[PDB]
DNA sequence: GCCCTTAGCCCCTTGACAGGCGGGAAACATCGTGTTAACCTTCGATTAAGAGTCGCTGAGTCGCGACG
């Protein structure tokens, strides 16, 4: 599930890096963190394996 | 024992507030528009390790006969 979240984050970073230039760019400014923690939250929030 | 006189209770008249829903007038936070023009002109899941049956389609096999 973290690999799925990382694939989503990679898609987001690929969609966002085309707009923001890489030369003189603020570090880690295009990498998102919502789908990273959202995947583990769903895994521990309402997953069938983490049900109880 | 009954009638007259006076006191207490009930009722009426006025009223000086108090503020209180509510529209208006105003000061201030919404909600639908625009507008800008420097680069990519196919994104992506999701069953599919049981099970009884409804509704449609399209291939290979035969009859009936005509023309040599």
Explain how this protein is built.
With 52 residues, the chain is mainly alpha-helical. The protein has two helices and no strands. The protein has helices at residues 2-17, 34-45. Helix 1 (2-17) runs antiparallel to helix 2. The longest helix is centred in the first third of the chain and has 16 residues, at 2-17. The two termini are 19 Å apart. It binds one DNA strand of 68 nucleotides through residues 11, 18. This is DNA-directed RNA polymerase subunit beta. DNA-dependent RNA polymerase catalyzes the transcription of DNA into RNA using the four ribonucleoside triphosphates as substrates. The RNAP catalytic core consists of 2 alpha, 1 beta, 1 beta' and 1 omega subunit. When a sigma factor is associated with the core the holoenzyme is formed, which can initiate transcription.
Roughly how many Å apart are the termini?
19 Å
Largest sheet: none
Question: What would you call the shape?
Answer: elongated
Determine the strand fraction and express it as a percent band. Answer: under 5%
SS field, number of helical segments: 2
Helix content: 40-55%
SSE string, helices as H and strands as E = HH
Radius of gyration using CA atoms only: 14 Å
Observed structural traits:
transcription, DNA-binding, 1 chains, mainly alpha, 52 residues, transcription activator, DNA-directed RNA polymerase subunit beta
Write a brief structural summary:
The chain is mainly alpha-helical. It has two helices and no strands.
């Amino acid at each position: 599930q973290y690999r799925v979240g990382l694939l989503r984050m990679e898609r987001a970073i690929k969609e966002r890096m085309s707009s923001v230039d890489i030369d003189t760019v603020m570090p880690h400014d295009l990498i998102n963190a919502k789908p990273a923690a959202a995947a583990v939250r769903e895994f521990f929030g309402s997953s069938q394996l983490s049900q109880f």
